[PDB]
Write a protein that binds this ligand. Structure first.
Ligand SMILES: N#Cc1cnn2c(NC3CC3)cc(-c3nnn(CCN4CCCCC4)c3-c3ccc(=O)[nH]c3)nc12
Length: 331
């Protein structure tokens, strides 16, 4: 028979209770601003679906970030715009300032608030135990808010986390892969970058939910406290699952497959092997021990579970002893 269905443990029907317009992005009508309000200053980078620039809004002298899109299905641009508008003003969510189009080229561009970011390949190695808890807590506020609003980010990784360390300011960006959660919906598993993909994506289990973001968050926490980037270093999507199995063990994986009646791709049989569940101590050493504590390991263990239903929710994660000092300092 086929796979056993699943439903999100929390915020299951928040979209069902909303008016259709909230989540039916295919019928969203884009509100366009004036492209002449912005002047491109410099290129920040490119990508498969966009080129991004730093720009100046000449009507108020505000520094902005402009993401000029390459050909993308209009429903997907509508999805990103709709999600950004629904989440506007939410804790640590990037602000979509404007949406403009080149009148000649017909090329759309999304205009975002600017964050004076310090690239993670320099910032992360300088972070203290307290910095890691503080910033993890800030990401959790962004995830609990978007999940409570019926949205999964589906692309949580260091590149999508903008940090202005001088001002202790964090923003979760790039909502281009984000989706609305609907109970019973089967989603595309070809989402997220390889190292952050949850087991549900790797075994082709389509009835996933917000908990997908908690796995990616666990991958980020592990890379930060162990200074091991990436934490699960797969050569491809098949080997990515092997890398997780070598840490979490094959027994919990096969119990996960059996529980949801998942048909495993036959390629997996001869590569998964048999592996015991390792203890987190084998990743601890003299140069990372200052970031590792029993509460960091307890929290990590509760995020990195094969069974998406058994991972902490963003709200349960925020109540973890790992954040007691951050919570006390914010009060
Ligand atoms: N939204 C937003 C946003 C706010 N600030 N801010 C900054 N600030 C730093 C300039 C100080 C940079 C970027 C950015 N830089 N490169 N890329 C593109 C991806 N990059 C290409 C080079 C290699 C690594 C991946 C982006 C971006 C913007 C929007 C987006 O949706 N995805 C990504 N985005 C933002």
């Amino acid at each position: 028979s086929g796979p056993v269905p699943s439903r999100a443990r929390v915020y299951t029907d928040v979209n069902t209770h909303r008016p259709r317009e909230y989540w039916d992005y295919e019928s969203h009508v884009v509100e366009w601003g004036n492209q002449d309000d912005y002047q491109l200053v410099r290129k920040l980078g490119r990508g498969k679906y966009s080129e991004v620039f730093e720009a100046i809004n000449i009507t108020n002298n505000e520094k902005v970030v402009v993401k000029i899109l390459k050909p993308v299905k209009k429903k997907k641009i509508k999805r990103e715009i709709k999600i950004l508008e629904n989440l506007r003003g939410g804790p640590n969510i990037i602000t979509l300032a404007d949406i403009v189009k080149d009148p000649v080229s017909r090329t759309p561009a999304l205009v975002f608030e600017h964050v004076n970011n310090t690239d993670f390949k320099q910032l992360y190695q300088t972070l203290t135990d307290y910095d890691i808890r503080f910033y993890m807590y800030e990401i959790l506020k962004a995830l609990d808010y978007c999940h409570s609003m019926g949205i999964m980010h589906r692309d949580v990784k260091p590149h999508n986390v903008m940090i202005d360390h001088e001002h202790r300011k964090l923003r979760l960006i790039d909502w281009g892969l984000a989706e609305f959660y609907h109970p019973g919906q089967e989603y595309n598993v070809r989402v997220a970058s390889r190292y952050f993909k949850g087991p549900e994506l790797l075994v082709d289990y389509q009835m996933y939910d917000y908990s997908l973001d908690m796995w990616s968050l666990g991958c980020m926490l592990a890379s930060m406290i162990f200074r091991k980037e990436p934490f699960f270093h797969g050569h491809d999507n098949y080997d990515q699952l092997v890398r997780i199995a070598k840490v979490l063990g094959t027994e919990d994986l096969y119990d996960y497959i059996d529980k949801y009646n998942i048909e495993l791709d036959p390629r997996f049989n001869d590569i998964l092997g048999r592996h015991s569940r390792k203890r987190w101590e084998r990743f601890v050493h003299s140069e990372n021990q200052h970031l590792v504590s029993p509460e960091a390991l307890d929290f990590l263990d509760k995020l990195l579970r094969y069974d998406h239903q058994s991972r902490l929710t963003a709200r349960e994660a925020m109540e973890h002893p790992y954040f007691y000092t951050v919570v006390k300092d914010q009060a």
